[PDB]
Write an enzyme that holds these catalytic residues in place. Sequence first.
Site, mmCIF file in Angstrom:
data_model
loop_
_atom_site.group_PDB
_atom_site.id
_atom_site.type_symbol
_atom_site.label_atom_id
_atom_site.label_comp_id
_atom_site.label_asym_id
_atom_site.label_seq_id
_atom_site.Cartn_x
_atom_site.Cartn_y
_atom_site.Cartn_z
ATOM 1 N N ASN A 39 -11.784 -0.628 -19.570
ATOM 2 C CA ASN A 39 -12.431 0.115 -18.793
ATOM 3 C C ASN A 39 -11.795 1.357 -18.089
ATOM 4 O O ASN A 39 -12.298 2.209 -17.730
ATOM 5 C CB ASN A 39 -12.538 -0.792 -17.480
ATOM 6 C CG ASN A 39 -13.711 -1.914 -17.797
ATOM 7 O OD1 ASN A 39 -14.708 -1.663 -18.450
ATOM 8 N ND2 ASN A 39 -13.691 -3.001 -16.905
ATOM 9 N N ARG A 90 -0.904 -9.793 -17.548
ATOM 10 C CA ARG A 90 -0.138 -10.904 -17.133
ATOM 11 C C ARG A 90 -1.355 -12.028 -16.972
ATOM 12 O O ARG A 90 -2.155 -11.833 -16.403
ATOM 13 C CB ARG A 90 0.544 -10.750 -16.019
ATOM 14 N N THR A 119 -0.060 1.815 -18.700
ATOM 15 C CA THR A 119 0.356 0.340 -19.478
ATOM 16 C C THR A 119 1.491 -0.363 -18.108
ATOM 17 O O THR A 119 2.437 0.565 -17.610
ATOM 18 C CB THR A 119 0.936 0.449 -20.340
ATOM 19 O OG1 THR A 119 -0.201 0.868 -21.424
ATOM 20 C CG2 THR A 119 1.332 -1.093 -20.786
ATOM 21 N N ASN A 120 1.183 -1.452 -17.933
ATOM 22 C CA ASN A 120 1.976 -2.191 -16.876
ATOM 23 C C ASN A 120 2.866 -3.152 -17.660
ATOM 24 O O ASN A 120 2.763 -3.693 -18.836
ATOM 25 C CB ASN A 120 1.212 -2.994 -15.791
ATOM 26 C CG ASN A 120 1.107 -2.367 -14.506
ATOM 27 O OD1 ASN A 120 2.031 -2.004 -14.071
ATOM 28 N ND2 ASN A 120 -0.416 -2.055 -14.154
ATOM 29 N N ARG A 148 -4.993 6.135 -2.594
ATOM 30 C CA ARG A 148 -5.507 5.018 -1.624
ATOM 31 C C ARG A 148 -5.277 5.338 -0.229
ATOM 32 O O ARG A 148 -5.874 5.093 0.558
ATOM 33 C CB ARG A 148 -4.811 3.858 -2.115
ATOM 34 C CG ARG A 148 -5.063 3.111 -3.432
ATOM 35 C CD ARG A 148 -5.168 1.794 -3.487
ATOM 36 N NE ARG A 148 -5.898 1.280 -4.606
ATOM 37 C CZ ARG A 148 -5.175 0.574 -5.804
ATOM 38 N NH1 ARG A 148 -3.650 0.728 -5.742
ATOM 39 N NH2 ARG A 148 -5.840 0.215 -6.789
ATOM 40 N N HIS A 167 5.132 0.644 -7.242
ATOM 41 C CA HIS A 167 4.244 -0.111 -6.199
ATOM 42 C C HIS A 167 4.464 -1.076 -5.367
ATOM 43 O O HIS A 167 5.788 -1.759 -5.606
ATOM 44 C CB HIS A 167 3.183 -0.727 -7.340
ATOM 45 C CG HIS A 167 2.115 0.369 -7.815
ATOM 46 N ND1 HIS A 167 1.657 1.464 -7.388
ATOM 47 C CD2 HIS A 167 1.562 0.199 -9.150
ATOM 48 C CE1 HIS A 167 0.997 2.217 -8.282
ATOM 49 N NE2 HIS A 167 1.006 1.566 -9.322
#
Lengths: 318, 318, 318, 319
Positions: free
Chosen positions: A15, A85, A120-121, A152, A176
């Site tokens: 997405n 995850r 990518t995480n 945000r 984050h």
Amino acid sequence: NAMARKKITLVGAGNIGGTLAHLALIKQLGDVVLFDIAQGMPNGKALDLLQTCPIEGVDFKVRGTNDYKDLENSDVVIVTAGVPRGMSRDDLLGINIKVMQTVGEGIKHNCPNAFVICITNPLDIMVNMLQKFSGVPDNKIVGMAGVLDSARFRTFLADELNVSVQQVQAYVMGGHGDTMVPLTKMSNVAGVSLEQLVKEGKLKQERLDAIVSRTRSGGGEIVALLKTGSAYYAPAAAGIQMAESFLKDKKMILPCAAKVKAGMYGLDEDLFVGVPTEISANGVRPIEVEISDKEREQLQVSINAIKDLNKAAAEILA
Amino acid sequence: MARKKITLVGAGNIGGTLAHLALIKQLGDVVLFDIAQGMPNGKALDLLQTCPIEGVDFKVRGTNDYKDLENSDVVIVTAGVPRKPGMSRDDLLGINIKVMQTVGEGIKHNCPNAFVICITNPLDIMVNMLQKFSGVPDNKIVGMAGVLDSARFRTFLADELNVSVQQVQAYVMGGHGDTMVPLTKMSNVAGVSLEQLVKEGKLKQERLDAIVSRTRSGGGEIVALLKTGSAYYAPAAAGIQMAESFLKDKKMILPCAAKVKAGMYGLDEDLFVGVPTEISANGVRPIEVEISDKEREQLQVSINAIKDLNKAAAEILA
Amino acid sequence: MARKKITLVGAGNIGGTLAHLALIKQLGDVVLFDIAQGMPNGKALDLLQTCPIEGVDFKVRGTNDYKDLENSDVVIVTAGVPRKPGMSRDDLLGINIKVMQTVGEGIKHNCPNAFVICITNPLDIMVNMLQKFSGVPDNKIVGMAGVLDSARFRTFLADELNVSVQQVQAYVMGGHGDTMVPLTKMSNVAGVSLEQLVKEGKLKQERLDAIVSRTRSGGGEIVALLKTGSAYYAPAAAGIQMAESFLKDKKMILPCAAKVKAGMYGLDEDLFVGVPTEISANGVRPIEVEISDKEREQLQVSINAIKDLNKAAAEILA
Amino acid sequence: AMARKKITLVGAGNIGGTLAHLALIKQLGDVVLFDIAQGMPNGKALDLLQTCPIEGVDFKVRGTNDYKDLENSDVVIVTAGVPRKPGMSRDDLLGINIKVMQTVGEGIKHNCPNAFVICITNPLDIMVNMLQKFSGVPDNKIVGMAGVLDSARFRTFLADELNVSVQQVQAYVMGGHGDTMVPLTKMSNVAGVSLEQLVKEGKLKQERLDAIVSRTRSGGGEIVALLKTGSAYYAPAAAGIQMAESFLKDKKMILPCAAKVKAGMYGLDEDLFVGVPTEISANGVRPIEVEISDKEREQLQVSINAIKDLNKAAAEILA
């Protein structure tokens, strides 16, 4: 000699990837390649996207692929691929370091001069891994993170204060969540700092604290709402913003995960860290801004988390 | 003066994409309605956080409550269940009729003066039902179908003949697939009709035939590649084009499912048919163009299929 | 990677508007050349100061020095004097031929691989001269003329028939005024030819005639209203449309003054003629479309005028 | 059937034509180009209209000499007036332009009293006041363009000096033009780093910063000396449209504009139009009070005094 169109390759056609593609077309940034390991799906998304183009009057093209060769001559590569995850932190890192290995070699072998944006995480470590396996120099790889937290934060402030998003500047560094460092003195509305707005009674300290807190948790907030999957519109918007600053040589300064040299921000060694970063035709360059003792102590949290991940990653690689 | 307001009833991929487009094109505030818990809010929050990046001050919110349709200038309906195996047509109809009822009544009670664009399938019948339960006048309801076929047809033409999409015009009538009516005399590249390009040997009749056939099946093609879900980018682009024409009073003529009065096109009763339709601030108006005998026969097929669905829907309702 | 660069030779009203449009559409850096002292720098400074308002990081600078042409991807030439009483045609030619020589040499010595769009009048001859003195190949020089006539024709048609400009296509060939060739079969509104609309009584022959005529005299009409100078907005827009097709490799087909080789359109010698021309990253390529006997006769009038100017220019040059 | 937005431009010189063009490009609404001059506005309108098929735009533009055509305008942007000619006295200048504001004002009053009114006519310090006086529009529906231009210039100079995007450069000003401009140097910043902090850090030489302020003060005159004929119009038009667009899209931008400020705000004794941060939304304009330094306030006093003097001269002319 005819000039080649710009070419953006999106490694990962989920997405976020499809959204990147769509924005790239609308803004007419160049031809788009949608890469994914999954059969058919990247082609289907490409075709659908391609068919928007007559409506929008656009003549840039988009194509799907499962092949790394199609990254050839890419000006920009944007990487969203990876596995999300009860999976351990070890197993997570293992699987994704592997994916960064494959994507990295693809880059190395097909477009080693590309500008590389990592999404990518976990972004803290994946940007380091992707450089390591693609071999691109420090100024040609960057991770997207700060820009999203800032979008945000700006969004929340604009709604709270009833003001245009164009007069709200929200500055962050670090990672984050609990590793995010809000730069609340430099963050401002039409030149008035967020702390000055409190002192003036224009903004309740409680409201500010809740907004900071809501920004820390903003990804999780959307995850809980969506039921399936995570945020993708704002993350894509952030990525394209960054890509666009490269492609148009804008020289924007944006909070991104960039390799910072030892000495800057009191660092002992080179590390990828969320810091204000210039993005131009020359790639990225971290900027050192003066921060308060408090903000620096908070930055140390992120630095220590990053060091811990770098160590885990080294162990996995050996 | 109130900001303009677009309500999207259905927050699936099409709905989300409509919302994203509406924000990028600064068409007004957006409300993203869905029956699902949390999800419309989550997407809407994600989308709203794109706004600082794009410098936009229009807002988007999510909702489960028809009351939030109040004062909508446009409502675009995508809600419904996609057909699946081995779901009978009667079953799809039964299900989506009841969504149209719930959505119709929401419109009627909360924004009866909205301009309503229907995207719910089967489009041939769902537009009719959406009017019946909303109670909106003929000029304020329209179905999106032809514009999508047109975009696809243009995409294939543009790539085949190596020319800008801006010089390709593709005119169609009727429905999708086997009920579509390609107008090969009107359709043209830079003023040269597709049938003329064939006479000139600039386009083989085989190629034209494959392109026509590919357009008929365009939706299924993407379905087969995606493996999950349907096209949504190009459908959203089509929907937003139609909406923009209303909002900006453009007076575009686009192929849409609109109510055609008995007499026009030789109809012996009022019907929703895919025809060239003017979209302006006054709503929609079907336009009668001259077409060949052959073309008329093809349109008859669609007309029959609509009449058939109309009988089936009437039965289900009794 | 170098930013793209557009040099505008001539900083009159057309030149300034070209520059403004290039900035708005983010096409690249802009150089605004003029022989006049101060003025190009002044406009360039004024235009550059729009950029923060529009969020644009491309630059614009003013110059008197051909050296500043270096690496220009596109050069658009508007420099020259307007004809005035009682200055003869010959007087103008002598003057503007000299400018083209100066400008041509500037191009040749500083950016010989630029794509050159000529706007200087009389366009029929000045594009030929610009190539001769610049030395650029056939595929890299083109004159703006048809696109302006097309734009006007569409404007009048759109207002007359109450439809969107996006459904009006107006095709023309040849030059301006009495040398223009209206292609009333190919020109169409939403796929219905202008001729057809007459047969159908949807457009009276008389109205089509007045609109054709009005398009012929479109430049003089504005001149008469302005009382000082000539049209410049629509001409600049036309110029930028062509430049964009080159820069974005769009492959639009547009009516432009392009070198046509002996044999095409029945020419017995290579000439610059107003013909449908593909514009892409590869430069220009004239395209032969089928036209009526009558249409061909009307083109011959233009062809004769161009041959006549070519003889007049040769004489002056000897 | 909802009406299209309507923007009327009173004055069809270079700024006015530019305002028209931007409005078309940004698809803000139909445009009416008014000018006293015969033919010329029609000629510009036609030329502008003829851009639209190329851009794909269906908004229209037409020319007029008739105030009746301002009817139903959502926004009126006024550039009309007579430029200071040499050797014209300040008295004669005011006299002539007060009269023009009178006529424009009555046109607005009689034809579109609910319009949002953006004044660009010079001298802006007094013309905005006059235009309100003769049009009768309330305080929240009239505003003068000045600060946005100075700030665009200031940002332009800073971005070039520091090699940074214009998007990360925010330049804040109040007061008038030139020597009445108040640069807000501590609030002005690059990516959140204040201009003064950039100096303290050696990223910007103080001299360079001073030169850039000074160059902003004189920015209009710089372009006038370069052009040889006339003055700036691209950046002034862009400023005016940014302002109009915040109204039309209800953006709630905060922008340095000539607005009517109430007594008590910024230590004022009476109501005055002053260049101040101003919110522009669908509700019109509202001045915002921000804390400024003692030095900056002293500098603001220079503009306030110049404005008072003009208000006095204006009253004496009217009487």
